[PDB]
């Protein structure tokens, strides 16, 4: 009945001993950390800014960073040694203003040493330093993205207003990895009021550098190839009578089918990430947010109508379910009657007997009408089974925010009421088979590798840790048939004139999507294309280009892929020198 009290007496004795040991730590072991120079000098504590991480692609080219911003501010209006300053600054006069004003913003690395000798440490002339995110090699905004200061709702989450929060598609995913620890320091201030000794109380972590799988070479070509499509988009819309609609609505994705790395992704109309960053309140960026178009959204991850690109998966679901052998016989007629209305073909005359390889080649629509007419009610559900197996329904695993790709099933139509005539339109991609260019690029990469369904990831390594790519295999009994039909499209189908004489043997399939708005002749320009179908010493590559309402995928999207493919394999043009 007494020993428990002896323990409490021993407890508080060892408790006050630990406090005494804690004080002795600060008093004796840390007195060199709080010296005051034998004077009545006070101590001021200031936090250290956090160096945000550097975003660079492979091969080491920096894409995002942040350095100092040197500015010249002066108050009062004293000349000092201005006989040298006026020619150096090129102002020829000192504008006398009452409030502090800035002269020559963004002092270069050569002018700053010359100014520092002329600063003389005087009260009027000083050089303020600032932190701002700098993009040396700007990449399309909707992929790369921008940076803003901490929002009022974000301040309550432990954010300092000087911190930089990234709403970017890429810089939001990397924000937990790019942010550094905002350290805290303390400096002894003399009675006069100057810095004496700095004291690091919390070391600022300089953030982590992320290595992307993007190639700055292919990235320039991707954004470049979007602009020449406008000349083709306006040319196509000219034959229809529609206005020139000079806006370049579309995106493009180029990735490696083997390692699952994405090499080039660009959307349009992109913006400049340097606008939101360095400028305090850029008025041009405020108009970008209120834009009637979508200059910020990444059209590579947004759902659109795939069109004839989806028929490549319809043939996959047709071969795996056992509907058609790889050597079936169907004549590509000009017209087909499902039973209620007449299914129209893209052409107007008889094409001839075709197989699965020939149907993919010339992109015959009447093939997928006769074949689905056998079992139109059960194939639609099995179609989405294989479609989601190829990577069309589920996400792609991209770090950037991605939208949901909708695949139609009988259960979905019940919760949206089903009619049998919807399967043929769903088979080609008309029945709200919403897909994204990212998901579309993955579907082709699966067929290119012959089973492997890799995950799309922009990041190659965070910090120094190489991110391993995750794979997944799909049950495909007949892969070569699809691969042959894809090159048969380049060899003899739609891409005959662009890529027929091309050096690298390419395969792919063109695509146009009757827009649900009016169906007036301006479809969605689509084209997919994977790398060397033959054992040619060229690294594999998959490219998919999309354009909103561009129309004529063979005339707009197909050359856009030829440009990116030429930039990847280094295909020389008219260079006889």
């Amino acid at each position: 009945g007494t020993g428990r009290i002896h323990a409490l007496a021993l407890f508080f004795a060892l408790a006050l001993f630990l406090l005494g040991l804690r004080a002795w730590q600060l008093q004796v072991l840390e007195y060199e950390r709080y010296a005051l120079r034998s004077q009545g000098n006070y101590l001021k504590t200031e936090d250290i800014p956090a160096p945000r991480g550097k975003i660079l692609d492979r091969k080491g080219r920096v894409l995002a960073q942040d350095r100092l911003v040197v500015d010249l501010v002066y108050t009062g209006g004293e000349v000092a040694f201005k006989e040298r300053l006026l020619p150096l600054l090129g102002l020829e006069d000192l504008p006398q203003v009452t409030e502090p004003t800035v002269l020559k913003a963004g002092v270069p690395e050569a002018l700053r040493p010359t100014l520092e000798e002329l600063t003389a440490g005087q009260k009027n002339l000083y050089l303020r330093e600032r932190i701002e995110r700098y993009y040396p090699n700007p990449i399309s905004g909707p992929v790369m993205g921008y940076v803003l200061r901490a929002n009022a709702a974000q301040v309550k989450q432990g954010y300092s207003p000087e911190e930089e929060v990234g709403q970017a598609g890429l810089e939001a995913a990397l924000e937990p990895y790019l942010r550094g620890k905002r350290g805290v320091r303390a400096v002894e201030v003399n009675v006069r009021g100057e810095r004496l000794r700095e004291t690091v109380l919390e070391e600022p972590t300089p953030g982590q550098d992320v290595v992307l799988t993007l190639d700055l070479a292919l990235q320039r070509a991707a954004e470049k190839a979007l602009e020449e499509a406008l000349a083709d988009i306006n040319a196509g819309r000219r034959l229809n009578g529609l206005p020139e609609e000079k806006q370049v609505k579309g995106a493009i994705v180029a990735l490696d089918p083997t390692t699952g790395e994405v090499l080039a992704m660009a959307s349009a109309p992109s913006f400049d990430p340097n606008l939101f960053a360095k400028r305090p309140v850029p008025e041009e960026a405020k108009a970008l947010l209120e834009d009637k178009n979508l200059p910020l959204l990444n059209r590579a991850v947004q759902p659109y109508t795939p069109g004839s690109t989806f028929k490549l998966a319809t043939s996959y679901a047709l071969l795996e379910e056992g509907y058609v052998t790889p050597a079936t016989t169907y004549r590509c007629s000009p017209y087909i009657v499902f039973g209620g209305q007449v299914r129209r073909n893209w052409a107007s005359r008889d094409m001839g007997p075709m197989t699965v390889r020939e149907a993919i080649a010339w992109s015959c629509n009447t093939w997928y009408y006769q074949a689905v007419a056998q079992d139109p009610l059960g194939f639609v559900d099995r179609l989405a089974r294989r479609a989601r197996l190829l990577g069309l329904g589920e996400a792609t695993g991209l770090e950037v925010a991605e939208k949901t790709g909708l695949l139609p099933t009988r259960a979905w139509k019940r919760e949206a009421p089903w009619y049998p005539g919807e399967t043929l339109s769903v088979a080609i991609g008309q029945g709200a088979v919403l897909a994204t260019p990212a998901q579309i690029a993955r579907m082709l990469a699966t067929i290119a590798t012959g089973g492997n369904k890799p995950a799309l990831h922009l990041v190659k390594a965070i910090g120094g840790v190489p991110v391993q790519p995750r794979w997944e295999k799909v049950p495909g009994r007949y892969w070569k048939v699809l691969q042959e039909g894809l090159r048969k499209t380049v060899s003899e189908g739609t891409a005959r004139f662009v890529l027929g004489e091309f050096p690298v043997p390419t395969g792919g399939k063109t695509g146009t999507a009757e827009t649900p708005g009016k169906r007036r002749g301006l479809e969605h320009a689509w084209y997919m294309g994977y790398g060397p179908t033959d054992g040619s010493p060229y690294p594999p590559l998959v490219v998919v280009a999309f354009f909103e309402n561009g129309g004529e995928g063979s005339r707009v999207a197909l050359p856009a892929v030829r440009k990116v493919m030429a930039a990847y394999w280094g295909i020389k043009g008219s260079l006889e020198v």
Binding site: A9, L16, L19, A23, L43, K156, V184, L201
Partner: protein
């Protein structure tokens, strides 16, 4: 009868002496030194009046004081004054009173008179003290007062740790309660609350913990010879000016203080005197190791002052009145 322990009175007198000396620089407002001096006069006069009472009459009002303290803890949330985001004071002009002081001095008597019987160590051992403790802490968390609630729970723990001692069942009970409650509060905690709690653990966040971080640097100024508040940080002001050879002097007096309080707790043969003096020395020592821990940057901030060393309108009187009850039950440890 002059049968007290003058060693305990000299230790209290030496600490309150350095308290008035340290308040000479910490808030040198002469108006504050007046209200502190008149507080010591009433704090010593009240203890002198409490000596005109018997121990039987003291424990005779255990349940009356506990029942009256619950009426004030339920009334302070209606006609009280909000000083720092919580109503926990009764100020009618020249009056200054806190119901939490009566709750501690009332629960120690009530839980001692109650636990003098047999505690069913099987299951319902913790049932009786929990039935008397939760109504007190429950009316304190609705102020809110987290620091004052921890002093109550620690004192109740000390009372149970002297009589009950369910060591095998108590530790396993705490480990389970310390893992289920955070697993329930953390998901339901708001981001404004989640970051607030995380800042309490790691104090390196300037917009709120700059002064509390400055305290760590303020204490280490002098060795061998602006803070937020004087009240909640008397130690930082005193430790900064007096170096390290002084800090051991204040830690020594508080170390000798909690020693004699436990030593005089052992001299009493009765169990209720064993429980009362243990809970009092537990509650008093708990604030010290917590207050000094906040200043030294070890214990999380709870908003408690240094007893017998801080500025208190009534906290000095209530602490002296508590010591008067300590000296009361010690000269009455033999007689019935």
């Amino acid at each position: 009868w002059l049968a007290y322990d003058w060693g305990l009175v000299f230790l209290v007198a030496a600490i309150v002496a350095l308290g008035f000396v340290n308040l000479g620089s910490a808030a040198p407002d002469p108006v504050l030194l007046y209200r502190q001096s008149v507080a010591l006069g009433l704090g010593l006069l009240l203890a002198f009046l409490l000596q005109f009472l018997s121990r039987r009459r003291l424990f005779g009002l255990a349940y009356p004081l506990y029942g009256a303290s619950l009426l004030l803890l339920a009334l302070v949330l209606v006609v009280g004054r909000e000083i720092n985001g919580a109503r926990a004071w009764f100020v009618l002009g020249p009056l200054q009173f806190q119901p939490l002081e009566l709750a501690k001095l009332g629960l120690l008597l009530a839980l001692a008179k109650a636990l003098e019987g047999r505690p069913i160590a099987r299951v319902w051992d913790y049932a009786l003290p929990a039935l008397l403790t939760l109504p007190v802490v429950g009316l304190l968390l609705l102020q809110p007062d987290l620091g004052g609630a921890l002093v109550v729970l620690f004192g109740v723990f000390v009372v149970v740790f002297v009589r009950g001692l369910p060591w095998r069942h108590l530790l396993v009970g705490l480990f389970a309660l310390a893992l289920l409650v955070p697993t329930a509060v953390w998901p339901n905690l708001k981001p404004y609350q989640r970051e607030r709690v995380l800042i309490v653990l790691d104090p390196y966040r300037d917009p709120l913990g700059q002064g509390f971080q400055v305290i760590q640097s303020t204490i280490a100024i002098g060795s061998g010879g602006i803070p937020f508040r004087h009240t909640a940080f008397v130690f930082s002001v005193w430790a900064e000016e007096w170096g390290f050879v002084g800090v051991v002097g204040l830690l020594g007096l508080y170390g000798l203080l909690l020693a004699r309080l436990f030593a005089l707790a052992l001299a009493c043969p009765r169990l209720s005197d064993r429980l009362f003096l243990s809970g009092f020395a537990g509650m008093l020592g708990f604030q010290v190791v917590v207050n000094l821990g906040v200043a030294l940057g070890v214990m999380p901030v709870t908003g408690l002052t240094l007893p017998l060393f801080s500025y208190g309108g009534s906290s000095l009187i209530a602490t002296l009145a508590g010591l008067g009850l300590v000296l009361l039950v010690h000269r009455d440890r033999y007689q019935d």
